[PDB]
């Protein structure tokens, strides 16, 4: 998978399961077009978001529906969602993992980009 | 100030200075309307974003221009910006401090809500 | 204050109040000597840890008692404490702000060094 | 592996490779006894730290030699190392992953505890 998303829960100390993940790509007219989506599994990942042929250079947005996740756990959250906006750049072979660590009033995100 | 933003640089160990901060508020037609903007000072904060009378209930987005910040420092970062989307003043007026900690391939955000 | 500590709670969206902070300084015999201690106030900071004259060059450890904090809130957390070990004043006197953001199964720490 | 350590680099956007990881267990006399150690691989993990028979309940310390890692990259770091101190508790089957995300002036750590 050229693009992987991993969601972790800082309160329970576990992968964040059943979280909706939406991916968008910026079109030529500067609007967000739905690209891929899924629900995280027991591993905190929504497996199989895209393919190497589809995941071309461009500007992408990964939206994680954190509010629904915290509401399901009964914890009052601050954010409506967590969004990660980045440019995908070909510079030799690349694999992107967008990882997010969630708390009710905070989130962290990092990118792990490997050859 | 009912809405404060503090931006920190995890590489240099300093406030992130001269960073552009843009705030939007969601309109009834579900579009994002410009609400306020500023530039961080030597303390990593843009002083005087809004007022008590203007900062009404709503869904707000704070966009911190991290890409321009890292580029000005000679680093090609991963993210286009650090975003923070939240509902404000839904249980009465509060003071919100949005803090962001920046690295070239990661960022964290947290909210401190007082009153 | 040459050494400031700010503790934030990522679950409640507030400063972490009544948290014990212990500071040690490494002695010539490679053992940790007690240096200062305090309790965070309503702003999440223990006011007046040390002075310019006492805060000499050395290797310091700031231990934040996160386990007692979470237990007092009814949470059984993962960590015993949040630690921060650093060399201070090696390139002349500086002001250090050690910030920690806490969750039951995670914590982050950052330093802001000024002067 | 009942105990796994994963180290990520927030500056390069990759696993932190060739990082020394030291694990200690608190003995009955309240001193830190070396338990296991290794160097992170290309995946950011020092594979095979312990076994299920050896990894009993107790207080453990995971020390990550961050300073040597940043010095090898030529970046001035703040911390002498990153330390994670926690209690291992049997409450049905458990597998512990200690993850750390590194920056020169900041580190984050989380625990992912699975059945
Ligand atoms: O020194 C102050 O006044 C001050 C204020 C707000 C602050 N927010 C942080 C913070 C944010 C994140 Cl997302 C992660 C971590 Cl470790 C720290 O540090 C602050 C310090
Ligand atoms: O054990 C694994 O496979 C695995 C993978 C990706 C991971 N990303 C993290 C992580 C992310 C953020 Cl944004 C902050 C922190 Cl403290 C940690 O931990 C991971 C563990």
């Amino acid at each position: 998978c050229p693009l992987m998303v991993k969601v972790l829960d800082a309160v329970r100390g576990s992968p964040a399961i059943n979280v909706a993940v939406h991916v968008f790509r910026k079109a030529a007219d500067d609007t967000w077009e739905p690209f891929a989506s899924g629900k995280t599994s027991e591993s905190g990942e929504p497996h199989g978001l895209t393919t190497e042929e589809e995941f071309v250079e461009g500007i992408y947005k990964v939206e994680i529906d954190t509010k629904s996740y915290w509401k399901a756990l009964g914890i009052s959250p601050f954010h409506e969602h967590a969004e990660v906006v980045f440019t995908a750049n070909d510079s030799g072979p690349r694999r992107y993992t967008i990882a997010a660590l969630l708390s009710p009033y905070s989130y962290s995100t990092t990118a792990v980009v490997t050859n």
Side-chain angles (χ1 to χ4, degrees), chain A residues 1 3-6 19 21 36-50:
Chain A
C1 284
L3 178 69
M4 295 167 287
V5 173
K6 171 85 155 184
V19 185
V21 174
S37 59
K39 282 260 191 167
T40 60
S41 67
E42 305 75 43
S43 68
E45 300 168 280
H47 304 266
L49 287 169
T50 191

Side-chain angles (χ1 to χ4, degrees), chain A residues 49-68:
Chain A
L49 287 169
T50 191
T51 61
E52 272 205 314
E53 52 269 32
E54 198 194 32
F55 194 53
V56 295
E57 292 183 317
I59 302 178
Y60 291 82
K61 181 187 272 201
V62 171
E63 179 190 308
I64 304 165
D65 185 1
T66 60
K67 188 174 191 174
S68 295

Side-chain angles (χ1 to χ4, degrees), chain A residues 9-29:
Chain A
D9 175 331
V11 171
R12 290 171 53 87
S14 64
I17 306 162
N18 211 15
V19 185
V21 174
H22 298 260
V23 190
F24 303 88
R25 191 184 176 269
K26 202 177 190 187
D29 64 294

